[PDB]
Amino acid sequence: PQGFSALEPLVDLPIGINITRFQTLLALHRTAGAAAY
Amino acid sequence: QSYTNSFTRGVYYPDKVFRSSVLHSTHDLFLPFFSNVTWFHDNPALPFNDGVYFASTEKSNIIRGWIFGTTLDSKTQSLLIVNNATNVVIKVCEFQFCNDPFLDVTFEYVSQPFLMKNLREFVFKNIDGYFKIYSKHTPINLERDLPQGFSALEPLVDLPIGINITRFQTLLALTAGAAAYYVGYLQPRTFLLKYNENGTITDAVDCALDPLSETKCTLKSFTVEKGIYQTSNFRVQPTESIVRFPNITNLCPFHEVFNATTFASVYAWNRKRISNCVADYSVIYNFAPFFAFKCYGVSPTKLNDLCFTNVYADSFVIRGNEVSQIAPGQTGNIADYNYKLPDDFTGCVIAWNSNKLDSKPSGNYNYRYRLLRKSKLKPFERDISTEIYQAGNKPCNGVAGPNCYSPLQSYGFRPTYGVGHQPYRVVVLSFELLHAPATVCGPKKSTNLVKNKCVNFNFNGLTGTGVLTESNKKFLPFQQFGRDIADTTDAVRDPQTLEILDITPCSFGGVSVITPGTNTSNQVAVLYQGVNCTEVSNVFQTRAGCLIGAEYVNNSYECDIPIGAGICASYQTSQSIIAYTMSLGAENSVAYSNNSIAIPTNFTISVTTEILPVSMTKTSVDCTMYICGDSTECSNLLLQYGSFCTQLKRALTGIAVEQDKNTQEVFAQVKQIYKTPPIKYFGGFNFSQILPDPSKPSKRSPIEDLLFNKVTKFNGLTVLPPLLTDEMIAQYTSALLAGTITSGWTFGAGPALQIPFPMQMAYRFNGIGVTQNVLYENQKLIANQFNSAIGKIQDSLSSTPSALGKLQDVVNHNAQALNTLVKQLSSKFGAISSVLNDILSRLDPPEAEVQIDRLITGRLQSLQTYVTQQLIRAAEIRASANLAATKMSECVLGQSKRVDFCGKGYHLMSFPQSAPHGVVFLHVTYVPAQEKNFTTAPAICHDGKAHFPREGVFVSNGTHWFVTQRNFYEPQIITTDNTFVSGNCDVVIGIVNNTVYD
Numbered sequence A: 001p002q003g004f005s006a007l008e009p010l011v012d013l014p015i016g017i018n019i020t021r022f023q024t025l026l027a028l029h030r031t032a033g034a035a036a037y
Numbered sequence B: 001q002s003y004t005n006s007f008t009r010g011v012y013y014p015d016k017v018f019r020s021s022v023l024h025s026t027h028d029l030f031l032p033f034f035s036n037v038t039w040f041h042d043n044p045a046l047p048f049n050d051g052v053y054f055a056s057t058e059k060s061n062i063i064r065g066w067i068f069g070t071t072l073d074s075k076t077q078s079l080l081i082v083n084n085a086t087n088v089v090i091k092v093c094e095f096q097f098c099n100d101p102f103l104d105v106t107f108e109y110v111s112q113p114f115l116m117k118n119l120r121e122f123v124f125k126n127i128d129g130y131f132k133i134y135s136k137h138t139p140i141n142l143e144r145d146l147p148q149g150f151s152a153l154e155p156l157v158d159l160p161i162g163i164n165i166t167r168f169q170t171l172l173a174l175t176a177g178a179a180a181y182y183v184g185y186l187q188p189r190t191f192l193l194k195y196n197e198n199g200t201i202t203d204a205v206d207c208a209l210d211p212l213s214e215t216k217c218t219l220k221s222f223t224v225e226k227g228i229y230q231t232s233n234f235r236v237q238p239t240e241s242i243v244r245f246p247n248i249t250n251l252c253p254f255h256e257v258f259n260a261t262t263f264a265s266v267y268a269w270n271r272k273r274i275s276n277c278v279a280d281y282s283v284i285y286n287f288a289p290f291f292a293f294k295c296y297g298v299s300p301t302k303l304n305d306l307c308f309t310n311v312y313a314d315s316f317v318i319r320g321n322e323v324s325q326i327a328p329g330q331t332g333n334i335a336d337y338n339y340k341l342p343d344d345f346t347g348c349v350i351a352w353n354s355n356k357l358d359s360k361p362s363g364n365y366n367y368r369y370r371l372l373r374k375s376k377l378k379p380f381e382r383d384i385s386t387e388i389y390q391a392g393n394k395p396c397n398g399v400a401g402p403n404c405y406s407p408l409q410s411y412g413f414r415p416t417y418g419v420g421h422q423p424y425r426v427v428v429l430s431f432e433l434l435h436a437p438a439t440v441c442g443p444k445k446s447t448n449l450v451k452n453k454c455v456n457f458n459f460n461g462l463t464g465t466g467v468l469t470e471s472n473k474k475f476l477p478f479q480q481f482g483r484d485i486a487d488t489t490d491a492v493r494d495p496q497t498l499e500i501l502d503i504t505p506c507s508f509g510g511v512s513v514i515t516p517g518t519n520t521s522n523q524v525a526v527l528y529q530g531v532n533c534t535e536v537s538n539v540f541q542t543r544a545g546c547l548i549g550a551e552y553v554n555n556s557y558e559c560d561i562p563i564g565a566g567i568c569a570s571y572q573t574s575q576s577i578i579a580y581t582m583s584l585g586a587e588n589s590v591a592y593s594n595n596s597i598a599i600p601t602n603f604t605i606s607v608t609t610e611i612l613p614v615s616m617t618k619t620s621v622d623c624t625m626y627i628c629g630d631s632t633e634c635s636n637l638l639l640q641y642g643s644f645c646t647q648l649k650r651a652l653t654g655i656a657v658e659q660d661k662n663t664q665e666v667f668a669q670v671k672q673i674y675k676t677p678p679i680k681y682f683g684g685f686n687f688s689q690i691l692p693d694p695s696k697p698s699k700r701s702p703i704e705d706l707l708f709n710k711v712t713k714f715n716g717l718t719v720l721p722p723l724l725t726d727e728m729i730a731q732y733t734s735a736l737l738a739g740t741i742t743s744g745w746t747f748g749a750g751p752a753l754q755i756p757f758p759m760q761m762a763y764r765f766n767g768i769g770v771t772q773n774v775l776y777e778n779q780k781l782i783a784n785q786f787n788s789a790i791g792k793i794q795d796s797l798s799s800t801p802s803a804l805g806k807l808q809d810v811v812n813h814n815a816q817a818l819n820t821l822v823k824q825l826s827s828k829f830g831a832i833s834s835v836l837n838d839i840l841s842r843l844d845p846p847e848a849e850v851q852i853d854r855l856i857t858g859r860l861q862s863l864q865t866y867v868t869q870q871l872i873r874a875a876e877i878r879a880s881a882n883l884a885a886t887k888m889s890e891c892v893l894g895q896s897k898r899v900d901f902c903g904k905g906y907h908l909m910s911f912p913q914s915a916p917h918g919v920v921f922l923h924v925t926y927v928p929a930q931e932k933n934f935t936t937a938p939a940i941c942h943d944g945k946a947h948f949p950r951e952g953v954f955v956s957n958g959t960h961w962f963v964t965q966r967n968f969y970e971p972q973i974i975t976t977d978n979t980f981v982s983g984n985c986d987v988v989i990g991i992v993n994n995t996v997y998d
């Protein structure tokens, strides 16, 4: 949608690790699944 | 209990410098005027404090010297002074005092004895390793208290001993000791000292004594003129300090590392890593008393001050005597084969007995330790490998027996064992610090909240000072602070309870001292600017602030000392300074009517003075000499900054040429030089007060002489003389006056055309709307009024100095600037000393470069500030000079119809006069007087035709109708000569039937 929704902080973690890549996990049953993000 | 008023006593010479007829401000230890001084008469230890003022009038000389020893015994070095008749012998050497030190009568200084109705004033001080003694001996009239007056204390001796002097004792030489000596204690104070031409201090002023004294210090003058003076700032200090961190909740598993009911063994010591928890050691200290609790890195209390990201816990059970092996740098079986702490270990070793719990009668063989390893273990290592030790040179072949032994062997712990073999529980805590964010700390403390008071606050790591009140603002849940438009904190969320507290800055404001002249009185009033009277004699609240010492009076007077929003203070006369709402002026209601006019019946010739600055002092600055002086290193360093000196020189040269142009524009209006005739008769008009006086060599008029009497090197600073001398400006003024007197306004617009002065003044009367007959019929009266006004001008100028306040101001400002520019040569600007040669001599070149650079930056900034202020002042003076030139052209070389430009009234003529750096204009004006009420009509109806006056107005005395000029009542019979018809009778409103003759 075309509108302003200001995002609010939830969690700040003192992890201190360098992150270079990421991945999304999904609850798929090995049932068809299709999620779009 | 004898206590006396100190009066104005105890002022000494701060340093060795001589000063003549100057007022100097010093921040030094001193005896405050009118202070708490103890008159003494067994003898306890008197504290020396920072210093002591000892005033003894003891003629009997029961007091022989002083004991400044800090112990009055042989323990430490005691300073002992003897002031016998022979000599004063300051002794420091180690003396074995007798049981009763009194005579029947290393570091030694022998001098002439201090003693000679003598007032022995002594000041004893000890600063920067020097003990200073100041003395004064003055005759006193018959009095048992300190005399009223001023006495300066000359230095007497300095000692380089510089030892700690905490207590001082008056030496006893006989036991009833009744000695009449006053003792006061000195304080860090700011003083203002007035030196005479002889070099001595005649008087002094204590700044923090009273508001009038504060304003004397601020103005650096002992006499304060009438006015309001901003002196200091007023701030409400924080009463209490508040620290607020979040609810201590969550906590480190310290109750689990202990009380584990099983510690495994020491051959494989349990390693526990703890992080991200609230550190609380109350349970640790509340556990059983500890056989051995040694901390190697930090103090146990300061453990809470230091925050650690990683805390390592190692728990094991060892014998009693093996605890000593668990220490940095220890050699032993357990230390080298089971668990080795590093040489630089930082942690706490905690050990407590476990015989009550971990000892079994049958023998607890669970706990094991290693007693055969190939080599020593590296620090912080755990070796759990248990294979057949190969002590023999034959292969063990995986079996044991001959020369092949099991690496591990167990303790057998039984309760009957004595100390030294009983099982001890040891929990070694290890702390590690690595360069990453931490987020692991100890019980952050918190205090009770204080509201509606000026408090220091530290709310969740945000520090500040202010007044905390309740706030209507509603924060979002994740927010903590509130910040306003100027990026200043205005609200805070309390961590412990989620409450929005608004922060208000604590009350602060200027302090102004409303004073009459010091000549008139010494009473003062104090205005706290912008402060509510609750936050701070008679207290009054005004929009300006809070006024203390002035009483509000309902009646209104003309403003004398401005304060604020319509409030003025004055010394009207117990009766004292009063504050009132200023009166704008007398209320006058003009009797307006449809047919009422007021015509003047007489006139007043009024002469007024207008003083205008024209030029300012021309100054040239040598940038290199000011910044650097004779130092070549400073010049080389200055070359790097650029061409700043060239720009400053260009600006100052521009100002100087502009000043010359200003004087030329104002005074060089006429090219010819006109001379007044030797026979000085001008129809009864006496111009002696404005014309030059040939008797005195100056060739200046009496008014010019009065003005010159009233108004009337360094370091690269030079004052360049003006191009036109005072004599040349006098010649210009004489030429302008002679031209005005002889030629009227004709000399301004072309050739000078002679005209008798009465005719010129008649034409000026025509210029202001009054006929010539008025002047020619009233010539003697006009002449007498002009003469009286010119006579009064001299007295008005001489009696009131403020009339010449403009020109003098300019001079003062210039001097002040120069003084500042020189005074900042003595300022350090963050260097070692203001003297460049001292810095160069004491410090090596590489280190001296930074000090010289700081001095250069400070001095160059000072020069830039001076030049910018000079440019702004030059702009102001140029505006004033342009106004003066316009007035000279339009008021002196002509008659101006502009209102209030040339005097107040109807302008007739202006006379110029020269004053130091300016021009004084004597404006002659026509003021109507003695007005009379008449009935007036817009037109007169005769023969069915309207009639309007050609010049003037129709007036009636009640029965008869006349026509008269506006500015003078000269009634004339209405005739066709002074009227024009222009219309019929019906249109005009207010027409009056009457007769017009021919």
Ligand SMILES: *[C@@H]1O[C@H](CO)[C@@H](O)[C@H](O)[C@H]1NC(C)=O
Pocket (backbone or CB within 6 Å): B082, B084, B085, B086, B087, B088, B089, B105, B110
């Ligand atoms: C007094 O003091 C001086 C100072 O050294 C000393 O020479 C003299 O002998 C002393 N006289 C007495 C009274 O002991």
Ligand SMILES: *[C@@H]1O[C@H](CO)[C@@H](O)[C@H](O)[C@H]1NC(C)=O
Pocket (backbone or CB within 6 Å): B197, B198
């Ligand atoms: C101080 O100076 C004045 C100058 O008139 C002089 O009369 C007086 O003797 C001086 N006081 C001294 C030298 O103690």
Ligand SMILES: *[C@@H]1O[C@H](CO)[C@@H](O)[C@H](O)[C@H]1NC(C)=O
Pocket (backbone or CB within 6 Å): B247, B495, B496, B497, B498
């Ligand atoms: C902290 O403890 C106090 C104790 O009364 C409680 O009122 C407060 O709500 C706690 N803090 C938070 C953020 O819940």
Ligand SMILES: *[C@@H]1O[C@H](CO)[C@@H](O)[C@H](O)[C@H]1NC(C)=O
Pocket (backbone or CB within 6 Å): B532, B533, B534
């Ligand atoms: C001073 O405080 C009082 C306290 O009620 C208040 O009424 C008054 O308005 C305050 N003065 C100013 C100028 O705000």
Ligand SMILES: *[C@@H]1O[C@H](CO)[C@@H](O)[C@H](O)[C@H]1NC(C)=O
Pocket (backbone or CB within 6 Å): B957, B958, B959, B960
């Ligand atoms: C008004 O003026 C006339 C002169 O024309 C004089 O005779 C008369 O007395 C004056 N009286 C009044 C009404 O003022």
Ligand SMILES: *[C@@H]1O[C@H](CO)[C@@H](O)[C@H](O)[C@H]1NC(C)=O
Pocket (backbone or CB within 6 Å): B993
């Ligand atoms: C002036 O005279 C005319 C002539 O008739 C008359 O009508 C008028 O009323 C007179 N003026 C006044 C004010 O009466």
